[PDB]
Amino acid sequence: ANSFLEELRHSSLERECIEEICDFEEAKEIFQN
Amino acid sequence: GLQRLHMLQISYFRDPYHVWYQGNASLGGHLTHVLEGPDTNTTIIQLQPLQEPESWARTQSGLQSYLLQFHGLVRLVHQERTLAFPLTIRCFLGCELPPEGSRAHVFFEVAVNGSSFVSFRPERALWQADTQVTSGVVTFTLQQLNAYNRTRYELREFLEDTCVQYVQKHIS
Ligand SMILES: CCCCCCCCCCCCCCCCCCCC(=O)O[C@H](COC(=O)CCCCCCCCCCCCCC)COP(=O)(O)OCCN
Ligand SMILES: *[C@@H]1O[C@H](CO)[C@@H](O)[C@H](O)[C@H]1NC(C)=O
Ligand SMILES: *[C@@H]1O[C@H](CO)[C@@H](O)[C@H](O)[C@H]1NC(C)=O
Ligand SMILES: *[C@H]1O[C@H](CO)[C@@H](O)[C@H](O)[C@H]1NC(C)=O
Ligand SMILES: [Ca+2]
Ligand SMILES: [Ca+2]
Ligand SMILES: [Ca+2]
Ligand SMILES: [Ca+2]
Ligand SMILES: [Ca+2]
Ligand SMILES: [Ca+2]
Ligand SMILES: [Ca+2]
């Protein structure tokens, strides 16, 4: 999930997809594939 | 009479990480403040002692925090969608108090490279595109601005509450 200016922080599977719900683009930002 | 505080900010971005700011503010037709400098050292001045030392220092602090957040948002749009540099952004904003007594009219319009881009709608505190050219950049910028309390409600409150009280106090 995104909060104000959080997206300037490096992507994090734990912070973004486990502690929060992440959308597909947020997941892709972690995969870097 | 129509009582108002206008604020203008021009931001020249040489690249994502460096910006030169140039701005000012006016109460009616009277110039009251100037802002100028690189992102690392932006000078903010009240031309006349309108606010006492402590209160001015608090206003300056809020403006410096805003500048870092504004730059941060431009850097984020670039990292996520790619922006073509150099670019110039102009923010023109303010509050206008009708003589009759109705609710203050406010605005916050953003232009990029001299053309209309996005602007704030205070009724529901939402941003809309002012350009009809669709792009990943416009869509993303609007998604971000419409996603947070900070860029919606806090921004509306700066215009409708902080700005309005400033006009009521320093013009009279
Ligand atoms: C009214 C008091 C007046 C005192 C005297 C005036 C001083 C004048 C001196 C300076 C000259 C004027 C020029 C600068 C104007 C700055 C505007 C400040 C607004 C501000 O602080 O906004 C805060 C929100 O910021 C945010 O949300 C940060 C981001 C905002 C969005 C910007 C939109 C640009 C879009 C860029 C996207 C990228 C596009 C890519 C091409 C909310 O205000 P607050 O913190 O006071 O809280 C109030 C709630 N309590
Ligand atoms: C106020 O700021 C604007 C930014 O576009 C600038 O063009 C204008 O000349 C400034 N006014 C003064 C008196 O410096
Ligand atoms: C803004 O204008 C500059 C200088 O003309 C140009 O190099 C740049 O691509 C433009 N950036 C935009 C439209 O975001
Ligand atoms: C807006 O910001 C967050 C939502 O993520 C929350 O902590 C806060 O309570 C919200 N604002 C208000 C006034 O409810
Ligand atoms: Ca998050
Ligand atoms: Ca995120
Ligand atoms: Ca992310
Ligand atoms: Ca954890
Ligand atoms: Ca979190
Ligand atoms: Ca993202
Ligand atoms: Ca992305």
PDB file of C-alpha atoms and ligand atoms in Angstrom:
ATOM      1  CA  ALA A   1       0.000   0.000   0.000  1.00  0.00           C
ATOM      2  CA  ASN A   2       1.050   3.602  -0.491  1.00  0.00           C
ATOM      3  CA  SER A   3       1.226   6.473   1.978  1.00  0.00           C
ATOM      4  CA  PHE A   4       2.534  10.005   1.288  1.00  0.00           C
ATOM      5  CA  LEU A   5       6.086   9.873  -0.135  1.00  0.00           C
ATOM      6  CA  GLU A   6       6.544   6.243   0.956  1.00  0.00           C
ATOM      7  CA  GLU A   7       7.352   5.435  -2.656  1.00  0.00           C
ATOM      8  CA  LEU A   8      10.675   7.272  -2.441  1.00  0.00           C
ATOM      9  CA  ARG A   9      11.728   4.468  -0.036  1.00  0.00           C
ATOM     10  CA  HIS A  10      13.279   1.362  -1.571  1.00  0.00           C
ATOM     11  CA  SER A  11      10.719  -1.362  -2.295  1.00  0.00           C
ATOM     12  CA  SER A  12      10.242  -4.021   0.385  1.00  0.00           C
ATOM     13  CA  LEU A  13       8.336  -7.310   0.172  1.00  0.00           C
ATOM     14  CA  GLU A  14       7.835  -7.285   3.929  1.00  0.00           C
ATOM     15  CA  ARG A  15       6.744  -3.668   4.360  1.00  0.00           C
ATOM     16  CA  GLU A  16       4.571  -3.558   1.265  1.00  0.00           C
ATOM     17  CA  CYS A  17       3.062  -6.938   0.570  1.00  0.00           C
ATOM     18  CA  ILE A  18       3.133  -8.789   3.918  1.00  0.00           C
ATOM     19  CA  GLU A  19       2.548  -5.992   6.502  1.00  0.00           C
ATOM     20  CA  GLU A  20       0.233  -4.294   3.994  1.00  0.00           C
ATOM     21  CA  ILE A  21      -1.718  -5.303   0.884  1.00  0.00           C
ATOM     22  CA  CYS A  22       0.189  -4.464  -2.309  1.00  0.00           C
ATOM     23  CA  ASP A  23      -1.141  -3.909  -5.790  1.00  0.00           C
ATOM     24  CA  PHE A  24       0.487  -5.468  -8.896  1.00  0.00           C
ATOM     25  CA  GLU A  25       2.760  -2.541  -9.735  1.00  0.00           C
ATOM     26  CA  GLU A  26       4.021  -2.424  -6.162  1.00  0.00           C
ATOM     27  CA  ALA A  27       4.818  -6.155  -6.417  1.00  0.00           C
ATOM     28  CA  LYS A  28       6.582  -5.626  -9.790  1.00  0.00           C
ATOM     29  CA  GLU A  29       8.675  -2.860  -8.210  1.00  0.00           C
ATOM     30  CA  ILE A  30       9.995  -5.528  -5.809  1.00  0.00           C
ATOM     31  CA  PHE A  31      10.528  -8.265  -8.449  1.00  0.00           C
ATOM     32  CA  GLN A  32      12.483  -6.069 -10.836  1.00  0.00           C
ATOM     33  CA  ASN A  33      11.940  -8.574 -13.614  1.00  0.00           C
TER      34      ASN A  33
ATOM     35  CA  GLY B   1     -13.704  45.014  -1.081  1.00  0.00           C
ATOM     36  CA  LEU B   2     -12.242  41.700  -2.323  1.00  0.00           C
ATOM     37  CA  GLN B   3      -9.621  40.633   0.297  1.00  0.00           C
ATOM     38  CA  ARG B   4      -7.061  38.117  -0.952  1.00  0.00           C
ATOM     39  CA  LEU B   5      -3.694  36.416  -0.500  1.00  0.00           C
ATOM     40  CA  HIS B   6      -2.056  35.082  -3.633  1.00  0.00           C
ATOM     41  CA  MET B   7       1.080  32.956  -3.712  1.00  0.00           C
ATOM     42  CA  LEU B   8       3.263  32.118  -6.697  1.00  0.00           C
ATOM     43  CA  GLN B   9       6.051  29.520  -6.911  1.00  0.00           C
ATOM     44  CA  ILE B  10       8.199  28.748  -9.980  1.00  0.00           C
ATOM     45  CA  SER B  11      10.429  25.719  -9.738  1.00  0.00           C
ATOM     46  CA  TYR B  12      13.184  25.244 -12.342  1.00  0.00           C
ATOM     47  CA  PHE B  13      14.374  21.625 -12.402  1.00  0.00           C
ATOM     48  CA  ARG B  14      17.751  21.147 -14.170  1.00  0.00           C
ATOM     49  CA  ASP B  15      17.489  17.451 -13.356  1.00  0.00           C
ATOM     50  CA  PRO B  16      15.533  15.343 -10.778  1.00  0.00           C
ATOM     51  CA  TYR B  17      17.733  16.187  -7.856  1.00  0.00           C
ATOM     52  CA  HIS B  18      18.398  20.005  -8.308  1.00  0.00           C
ATOM     53  CA  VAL B  19      15.858  22.822  -8.278  1.00  0.00           C
ATOM     54  CA  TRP B  20      15.874  26.580  -8.207  1.00  0.00           C
ATOM     55  CA  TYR B  21      12.804  28.121  -6.566  1.00  0.00           C
ATOM     56  CA  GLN B  22      11.477  31.641  -7.166  1.00  0.00           C
ATOM     57  CA  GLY B  23       8.239  32.845  -5.652  1.00  0.00           C
ATOM     58  CA  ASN B  24       6.312  35.584  -3.923  1.00  0.00           C
ATOM     59  CA  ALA B  25       3.055  36.444  -2.220  1.00  0.00           C
ATOM     60  CA  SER B  26       0.750  39.470  -2.259  1.00  0.00           C
ATOM     61  CA  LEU B  27      -2.132  40.751  -0.140  1.00  0.00           C
ATOM     62  CA  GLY B  28      -4.416  42.477  -2.646  1.00  0.00           C
ATOM     63  CA  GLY B  29      -2.112  44.362  -4.989  1.00  0.00           C
ATOM     64  CA  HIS B  30       0.652  44.714  -2.376  1.00  0.00           C
ATOM     65  CA  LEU B  31       3.776  42.521  -2.563  1.00  0.00           C
ATOM     66  CA  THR B  32       4.373  41.020   0.874  1.00  0.00           C
ATOM     67  CA  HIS B  33       6.794  38.123   0.562  1.00  0.00           C
ATOM     68  CA  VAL B  34       9.602  36.760  -1.634  1.00  0.00           C
ATOM     69  CA  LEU B  35      11.073  33.256  -1.829  1.00  0.00           C
ATOM     70  CA  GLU B  36      14.236  32.396  -3.784  1.00  0.00           C
ATOM     71  CA  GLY B  37      17.127  30.006  -3.865  1.00  0.00           C
ATOM     72  CA  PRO B  38      18.354  26.477  -4.579  1.00  0.00           C
ATOM     73  CA  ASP B  39      16.596  23.531  -2.841  1.00  0.00           C
ATOM     74  CA  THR B  40      19.518  23.356  -0.430  1.00  0.00           C
ATOM     75  CA  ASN B  41      19.178  27.013   0.713  1.00  0.00           C
ATOM     76  CA  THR B  42      15.883  28.700  -0.127  1.00  0.00           C
ATOM     77  CA  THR B  43      15.522  32.187   1.383  1.00  0.00           C
ATOM     78  CA  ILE B  44      11.972  33.078   2.525  1.00  0.00           C
ATOM     79  CA  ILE B  45      11.343  36.724   3.506  1.00  0.00           C
ATOM     80  CA  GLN B  46       8.420  38.871   4.650  1.00  0.00           C
ATOM     81  CA  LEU B  47       9.080  42.338   3.217  1.00  0.00           C
ATOM     82  CA  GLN B  48       7.158  43.930   6.073  1.00  0.00           C
ATOM     83  CA  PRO B  49       6.989  42.677   9.795  1.00  0.00           C
ATOM     84  CA  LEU B  50       3.473  41.201   9.338  1.00  0.00           C
ATOM     85  CA  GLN B  51       4.148  38.276  11.653  1.00  0.00           C
ATOM     86  CA  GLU B  52       6.109  38.536  14.938  1.00  0.00           C
ATOM     87  CA  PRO B  53       9.429  36.523  15.210  1.00  0.00           C
ATOM     88  CA  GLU B  54       8.071  33.273  16.573  1.00  0.00           C
ATOM     89  CA  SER B  55       5.027  33.107  14.284  1.00  0.00           C
ATOM     90  CA  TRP B  56       7.163  33.937  11.207  1.00  0.00           C
ATOM     91  CA  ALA B  57       9.638  31.191  12.130  1.00  0.00           C
ATOM     92  CA  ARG B  58       6.714  28.694  12.306  1.00  0.00           C
ATOM     93  CA  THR B  59       5.417  29.802   8.877  1.00  0.00           C
ATOM     94  CA  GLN B  60       8.928  29.542   7.377  1.00  0.00           C
ATOM     95  CA  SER B  61       9.241  26.030   8.832  1.00  0.00           C
ATOM     96  CA  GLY B  62       5.988  24.891   7.189  1.00  0.00           C
ATOM     97  CA  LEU B  63       7.063  26.405   3.855  1.00  0.00           C
ATOM     98  CA  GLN B  64      10.452  24.654   3.983  1.00  0.00           C
ATOM     99  CA  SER B  65       8.737  21.311   4.713  1.00  0.00           C
ATOM    100  CA  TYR B  66       6.366  21.932   1.832  1.00  0.00           C
ATOM    101  CA  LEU B  67       9.306  22.629  -0.571  1.00  0.00           C
ATOM    102  CA  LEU B  68      11.029  19.351   0.329  1.00  0.00           C
ATOM    103  CA  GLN B  69       7.727  17.436  -0.142  1.00  0.00           C
ATOM    104  CA  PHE B  70       7.009  19.171  -3.476  1.00  0.00           C
ATOM    105  CA  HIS B  71      10.504  18.252  -4.754  1.00  0.00           C
ATOM    106  CA  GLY B  72       9.951  14.717  -3.395  1.00  0.00           C
ATOM    107  CA  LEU B  73       6.743  14.325  -5.381  1.00  0.00           C
ATOM    108  CA  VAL B  74       8.437  15.508  -8.617  1.00  0.00           C
ATOM    109  CA  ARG B  75      11.291  13.033  -7.988  1.00  0.00           C
ATOM    110  CA  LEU B  76       8.701  10.268  -7.414  1.00  0.00           C
ATOM    111  CA  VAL B  77       6.824  10.970 -10.681  1.00  0.00           C
ATOM    112  CA  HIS B  78      10.164  10.807 -12.468  1.00  0.00           C
ATOM    113  CA  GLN B  79      11.176   7.507 -10.782  1.00  0.00           C
ATOM    114  CA  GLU B  80       7.842   5.933 -11.525  1.00  0.00           C
ATOM    115  CA  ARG B  81       6.894   7.278 -14.942  1.00  0.00           C
ATOM    116  CA  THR B  82       9.918   9.257 -16.349  1.00  0.00           C
ATOM    117  CA  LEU B  83       9.937  13.024 -16.770  1.00  0.00           C
ATOM    118  CA  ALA B  84      11.908  14.870 -19.500  1.00  0.00           C
ATOM    119  CA  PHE B  85      14.343  17.389 -17.952  1.00  0.00           C
ATOM    120  CA  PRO B  86      14.898  20.415 -17.790  1.00  0.00           C
ATOM    121  CA  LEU B  87      11.415  21.422 -16.793  1.00  0.00           C
ATOM    122  CA  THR B  88       9.738  24.298 -15.073  1.00  0.00           C
ATOM    123  CA  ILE B  89       6.670  24.000 -12.818  1.00  0.00           C
ATOM    124  CA  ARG B  90       4.490  26.950 -11.778  1.00  0.00           C
ATOM    125  CA  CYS B  91       2.132  26.793  -8.816  1.00  0.00           C
ATOM    126  CA  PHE B  92      -0.330  29.711  -8.441  1.00  0.00           C
ATOM    127  CA  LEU B  93      -2.579  29.533  -5.398  1.00  0.00           C
ATOM    128  CA  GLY B  94      -4.548  31.605  -2.977  1.00  0.00           C
ATOM    129  CA  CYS B  95      -7.680  32.505  -1.089  1.00  0.00           C
ATOM    130  CA  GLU B  96     -10.209  35.241  -1.837  1.00  0.00           C
ATOM    131  CA  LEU B  97     -12.774  36.415   0.671  1.00  0.00           C
ATOM    132  CA  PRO B  98     -16.041  37.781  -0.820  1.00  0.00           C
ATOM    133  CA  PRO B  99     -17.275  41.141   0.697  1.00  0.00           C
ATOM    134  CA  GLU B 100     -20.791  39.705   1.122  1.00  0.00           C
ATOM    135  CA  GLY B 101     -19.734  36.981   3.550  1.00  0.00           C
ATOM    136  CA  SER B 102     -19.989  33.759   1.524  1.00  0.00           C
ATOM    137  CA  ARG B 103     -17.311  31.010   1.768  1.00  0.00           C
ATOM    138  CA  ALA B 104     -13.774  31.960   0.674  1.00  0.00           C
ATOM    139  CA  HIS B 105     -12.905  30.978  -2.895  1.00  0.00           C
ATOM    140  CA  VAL B 106      -9.585  29.126  -3.160  1.00  0.00           C
ATOM    141  CA  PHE B 107      -7.382  27.751  -5.907  1.00  0.00           C
ATOM    142  CA  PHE B 108      -4.159  25.901  -6.562  1.00  0.00           C
ATOM    143  CA  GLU B 109      -3.204  25.594 -10.247  1.00  0.00           C
ATOM    144  CA  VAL B 110      -0.095  23.805 -11.528  1.00  0.00           C
ATOM    145  CA  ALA B 111       1.435  24.502 -14.949  1.00  0.00           C
ATOM    146  CA  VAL B 112       4.407  22.611 -16.472  1.00  0.00           C
ATOM    147  CA  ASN B 113       6.691  24.256 -19.075  1.00  0.00           C
ATOM    148  CA  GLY B 114       4.177  27.135 -19.359  1.00  0.00           C
ATOM    149  CA  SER B 115       1.127  24.952 -20.063  1.00  0.00           C
ATOM    150  CA  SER B 116      -1.877  24.098 -17.794  1.00  0.00           C
ATOM    151  CA  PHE B 117      -1.395  20.689 -16.123  1.00  0.00           C
ATOM    152  CA  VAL B 118      -3.492  19.967 -13.018  1.00  0.00           C
ATOM    153  CA  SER B 119      -5.507  22.024 -10.533  1.00  0.00           C
ATOM    154  CA  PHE B 120      -7.238  21.588  -7.208  1.00  0.00           C
ATOM    155  CA  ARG B 121     -10.971  21.443  -6.775  1.00  0.00           C
ATOM    156  CA  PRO B 122     -11.823  22.335  -3.159  1.00  0.00           C
ATOM    157  CA  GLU B 123     -15.424  21.102  -3.029  1.00  0.00           C
ATOM    158  CA  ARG B 124     -14.425  17.453  -2.580  1.00  0.00           C
ATOM    159  CA  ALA B 125     -10.710  18.201  -2.196  1.00  0.00           C
ATOM    160  CA  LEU B 126      -9.687  16.486  -5.418  1.00  0.00           C
ATOM    161  CA  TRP B 127      -7.210  17.264  -8.175  1.00  0.00           C
ATOM    162  CA  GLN B 128      -8.187  17.229 -11.879  1.00  0.00           C
ATOM    163  CA  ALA B 129      -6.301  17.504 -15.180  1.00  0.00           C
ATOM    164  CA  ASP B 130      -6.395  20.921 -16.851  1.00  0.00           C
ATOM    165  CA  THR B 131      -4.776  19.507 -19.987  1.00  0.00           C
ATOM    166  CA  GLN B 132      -6.644  17.277 -22.426  1.00  0.00           C
ATOM    167  CA  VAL B 133      -3.446  15.457 -23.474  1.00  0.00           C
ATOM    168  CA  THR B 134      -3.538  12.078 -21.732  1.00  0.00           C
ATOM    169  CA  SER B 135      -0.278  10.616 -20.479  1.00  0.00           C
ATOM    170  CA  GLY B 136       1.070   8.168 -17.918  1.00  0.00           C
ATOM    171  CA  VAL B 137       2.583  11.202 -16.125  1.00  0.00           C
ATOM    172  CA  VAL B 138      -0.713  13.061 -15.742  1.00  0.00           C
ATOM    173  CA  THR B 139      -2.601   9.934 -14.676  1.00  0.00           C
ATOM    174  CA  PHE B 140       0.068   9.016 -12.092  1.00  0.00           C
ATOM    175  CA  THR B 141       0.442  12.568 -10.736  1.00  0.00           C
ATOM    176  CA  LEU B 142      -3.342  12.773 -10.206  1.00  0.00           C
ATOM    177  CA  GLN B 143      -3.452   9.308  -8.604  1.00  0.00           C
ATOM    178  CA  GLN B 144      -0.797  10.420  -6.101  1.00  0.00           C
ATOM    179  CA  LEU B 145      -2.347  13.806  -5.340  1.00  0.00           C
ATOM    180  CA  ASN B 146      -5.787  12.236  -4.833  1.00  0.00           C
ATOM    181  CA  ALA B 147      -4.487   9.406  -2.660  1.00  0.00           C
ATOM    182  CA  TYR B 148      -3.448  11.118   0.563  1.00  0.00           C
ATOM    183  CA  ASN B 149      -4.787  13.287   3.367  1.00  0.00           C
ATOM    184  CA  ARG B 150      -1.765  15.553   2.968  1.00  0.00           C
ATOM    185  CA  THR B 151      -2.324  16.508  -0.640  1.00  0.00           C
ATOM    186  CA  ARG B 152      -6.139  16.648  -0.307  1.00  0.00           C
ATOM    187  CA  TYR B 153      -7.438  17.748   3.112  1.00  0.00           C
ATOM    188  CA  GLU B 154      -4.354  19.345   4.619  1.00  0.00           C
ATOM    189  CA  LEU B 155      -3.892  21.287   1.353  1.00  0.00           C
ATOM    190  CA  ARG B 156      -7.573  22.389   1.395  1.00  0.00           C
ATOM    191  CA  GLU B 157      -7.100  23.452   5.026  1.00  0.00           C
ATOM    192  CA  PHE B 158      -4.045  25.490   4.167  1.00  0.00           C
ATOM    193  CA  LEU B 159      -6.121  27.378   1.582  1.00  0.00           C
ATOM    194  CA  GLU B 160      -9.474  27.665   3.370  1.00  0.00           C
ATOM    195  CA  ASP B 161      -8.248  27.969   6.956  1.00  0.00           C
ATOM    196  CA  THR B 162      -4.608  29.113   7.208  1.00  0.00           C
ATOM    197  CA  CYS B 163      -4.730  31.448   4.206  1.00  0.00           C
ATOM    198  CA  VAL B 164      -8.116  32.897   5.147  1.00  0.00           C
ATOM    199  CA  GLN B 165      -7.073  33.611   8.761  1.00  0.00           C
ATOM    200  CA  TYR B 166      -3.899  35.281   7.470  1.00  0.00           C
ATOM    201  CA  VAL B 167      -5.978  37.599   5.223  1.00  0.00           C
ATOM    202  CA  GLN B 168      -8.382  38.432   8.102  1.00  0.00           C
ATOM    203  CA  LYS B 169      -5.524  39.228  10.469  1.00  0.00           C
ATOM    204  CA  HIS B 170      -2.988  41.135   8.300  1.00  0.00           C
ATOM    205  CA  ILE B 171      -5.293  43.189   6.013  1.00  0.00           C
ATOM    206  CA  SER B 172      -8.336  43.577   8.379  1.00  0.00           C
TER     207      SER B 172
HETATM  208  C1  LIG C   1      -1.337  31.003   4.444  1.00  0.00           C
HETATM  209  C2  LIG C   1      -0.156  31.411   5.273  1.00  0.00           C
HETATM  210  C3  LIG C   1       0.606  32.384   4.476  1.00  0.00           C
HETATM  211  C4  LIG C   1       1.820  32.872   5.198  1.00  0.00           C
HETATM  212  C5  LIG C   1       2.559  33.873   4.348  1.00  0.00           C
HETATM  213  C6  LIG C   1       2.829  33.325   2.963  1.00  0.00           C
HETATM  214  C7  LIG C   1       4.274  33.001   2.798  1.00  0.00           C
HETATM  215  C8  LIG C   1       4.706  33.298   1.395  1.00  0.00           C
HETATM  216  C9  LIG C   1       6.171  33.075   1.198  1.00  0.00           C
HETATM  217  C10 LIG C   1       6.460  32.105   0.066  1.00  0.00           C
HETATM  218  C11 LIG C   1       5.930  32.573  -1.300  1.00  0.00           C
HETATM  219  C12 LIG C   1       4.803  31.661  -1.781  1.00  0.00           C
HETATM  220  C13 LIG C   1       5.266  30.453  -2.625  1.00  0.00           C
HETATM  221  C14 LIG C   1       5.136  29.105  -1.915  1.00  0.00           C
HETATM  222  C15 LIG C   1       3.684  28.670  -1.585  1.00  0.00           C
HETATM  223  C16 LIG C   1       3.685  27.339  -0.822  1.00  0.00           C
HETATM  224  C17 LIG C   1       2.328  26.726  -0.508  1.00  0.00           C
HETATM  225  C18 LIG C   1       2.305  26.080   0.883  1.00  0.00           C
HETATM  226  C19 LIG C   1       1.212  25.007   1.031  1.00  0.00           C
HETATM  227  C20 LIG C   1       1.438  23.950   2.098  1.00  0.00           C
HETATM  228  O1  LIG C   1       2.222  24.052   3.018  1.00  0.00           O
HETATM  229  O2  LIG C   1       0.625  22.852   1.858  1.00  0.00           O
HETATM  230  C21 LIG C   1       0.544  21.766   2.814  1.00  0.00           C
HETATM  231  C22 LIG C   1       0.369  20.504   2.011  1.00  0.00           C
HETATM  232  O3  LIG C   1       1.555  20.314   1.191  1.00  0.00           O
HETATM  233  C23 LIG C   1       1.555  19.239   0.332  1.00  0.00           C
HETATM  234  O4  LIG C   1       0.593  18.526   0.124  1.00  0.00           O
HETATM  235  C24 LIG C   1       2.901  19.045  -0.414  1.00  0.00           C
HETATM  236  C25 LIG C   1       2.682  18.786  -1.941  1.00  0.00           C
HETATM  237  C26 LIG C   1       1.575  19.724  -2.527  1.00  0.00           C
HETATM  238  C27 LIG C   1       1.231  19.511  -3.992  1.00  0.00           C
HETATM  239  C28 LIG C   1       1.903  20.453  -4.952  1.00  0.00           C
HETATM  240  C29 LIG C   1       1.352  20.217  -6.355  1.00  0.00           C
HETATM  241  C30 LIG C   1       2.436  20.237  -7.414  1.00  0.00           C
HETATM  242  C31 LIG C   1       2.432  18.972  -8.267  1.00  0.00           C
HETATM  243  C32 LIG C   1       3.848  18.456  -8.622  1.00  0.00           C
HETATM  244  C33 LIG C   1       3.761  17.051  -9.190  1.00  0.00           C
HETATM  245  C34 LIG C   1       4.809  16.650 -10.239  1.00  0.00           C
HETATM  246  C35 LIG C   1       4.425  16.946 -11.691  1.00  0.00           C
HETATM  247  C36 LIG C   1       5.511  16.473 -12.669  1.00  0.00           C
HETATM  248  C37 LIG C   1       5.731  17.420 -13.850  1.00  0.00           C
HETATM  249  C38 LIG C   1      -0.648  21.971   3.746  1.00  0.00           C
HETATM  250  O5  LIG C   1      -0.352  23.112   4.537  1.00  0.00           O
HETATM  251  P1  LIG C   1       0.116  23.013   6.059  1.00  0.00           P
HETATM  252  O6  LIG C   1       1.441  22.126   6.203  1.00  0.00           O
HETATM  253  O7  LIG C   1       0.362  24.444   6.560  1.00  0.00           O
HETATM  254  O8  LIG C   1      -1.113  22.336   6.920  1.00  0.00           O
HETATM  255  C39 LIG C   1      -2.473  22.857   6.959  1.00  0.00           C
HETATM  256  C40 LIG C   1      -3.385  21.839   7.644  1.00  0.00           C
HETATM  257  N1  LIG C   1      -3.260  22.020   8.972  1.00  0.00           N
HETATM  258  C1  LIG C   2       6.751  36.891  -8.454  1.00  0.00           C
HETATM  259  O1  LIG C   2       7.051  35.545  -8.854  1.00  0.00           O
HETATM  260  C2  LIG C   2       6.883  35.354 -10.282  1.00  0.00           C
HETATM  261  C3  LIG C   2       7.123  33.919 -10.598  1.00  0.00           C
HETATM  262  O2  LIG C   2       6.615  33.626 -11.899  1.00  0.00           O
HETATM  263  C4  LIG C   2       7.831  36.228 -11.049  1.00  0.00           C
HETATM  264  O3  LIG C   2       7.709  35.986 -12.447  1.00  0.00           O
HETATM  265  C5  LIG C   2       7.463  37.648 -10.722  1.00  0.00           C
HETATM  266  O4  LIG C   2       8.313  38.520 -11.433  1.00  0.00           O
HETATM  267  C6  LIG C   2       7.671  37.837  -9.221  1.00  0.00           C
HETATM  268  N1  LIG C   2       7.436  39.211  -8.844  1.00  0.00           N
HETATM  269  C7  LIG C   2       8.426  39.958  -8.360  1.00  0.00           C
HETATM  270  C8  LIG C   2       8.033  41.365  -7.915  1.00  0.00           C
HETATM  271  O5  LIG C   2       9.600  39.562  -8.255  1.00  0.00           O
HETATM  272  C1  LIG C   3      10.293  21.256 -20.797  1.00  0.00           C
HETATM  273  O1  LIG C   3      11.026  22.136 -21.664  1.00  0.00           O
HETATM  274  C2  LIG C   3      12.411  21.751 -21.813  1.00  0.00           C
HETATM  275  C3  LIG C   3      13.132  22.911 -22.475  1.00  0.00           C
HETATM  276  O2  LIG C   3      12.456  23.309 -23.656  1.00  0.00           O
HETATM  277  C4  LIG C   3      12.485  20.418 -22.579  1.00  0.00           C
HETATM  278  O3  LIG C   3      13.843  20.025 -22.769  1.00  0.00           O
HETATM  279  C5  LIG C   3      11.768  19.356 -21.746  1.00  0.00           C
HETATM  280  O4  LIG C   3      11.684  18.146 -22.491  1.00  0.00           O
HETATM  281  C6  LIG C   3      10.353  19.796 -21.323  1.00  0.00           C
HETATM  282  N1  LIG C   3       9.909  18.874 -20.291  1.00  0.00           N
HETATM  283  C7  LIG C   3       8.625  18.550 -20.124  1.00  0.00           C
HETATM  284  C8  LIG C   3       7.608  19.058 -21.140  1.00  0.00           C
HETATM  285  O5  LIG C   3       8.242  17.853 -19.166  1.00  0.00           O
HETATM  286  C1  LIG C   4      -5.677  10.331   6.993  1.00  0.00           C
HETATM  287  O1  LIG C   4      -4.368   9.743   7.179  1.00  0.00           O
HETATM  288  C2  LIG C   4      -4.360   8.412   7.744  1.00  0.00           C
HETATM  289  C3  LIG C   4      -4.940   7.454   6.719  1.00  0.00           C
HETATM  290  O2  LIG C   4      -3.946   6.544   6.262  1.00  0.00           O
HETATM  291  C4  LIG C   4      -5.045   8.386   9.112  1.00  0.00           C
HETATM  292  O3  LIG C   4      -4.071   8.086  10.104  1.00  0.00           O
HETATM  293  C5  LIG C   4      -5.726   9.722   9.451  1.00  0.00           C
HETATM  294  O4  LIG C   4      -6.592   9.521  10.559  1.00  0.00           O
HETATM  295  C6  LIG C   4      -6.541  10.258   8.264  1.00  0.00           C
HETATM  296  N1  LIG C   4      -7.055  11.593   8.564  1.00  0.00           N
HETATM  297  C7  LIG C   4      -8.172  11.783   9.275  1.00  0.00           C
HETATM  298  C8  LIG C   4      -8.475  13.219   9.704  1.00  0.00           C
HETATM  299  O5  LIG C   4      -8.919  10.863   9.636  1.00  0.00           O
HETATM  300 CA    CA C   5       3.566   1.079   2.133  1.00  0.00          CA
HETATM  301 CA    CA C   6       4.189   0.975  -1.614  1.00  0.00          CA
HETATM  302 CA    CA C   7       6.970   0.523  -4.029  1.00  0.00          CA
HETATM  303 CA    CA C   8       7.389  -6.893   9.319  1.00  0.00          CA
HETATM  304 CA    CA C   9       3.170   0.175   6.494  1.00  0.00          CA
HETATM  305 CA    CA C  10       5.046   2.521  -6.772  1.00  0.00          CA
HETATM  306 CA    CA C  11       6.224   1.589 -10.483  1.00  0.00          CA
END
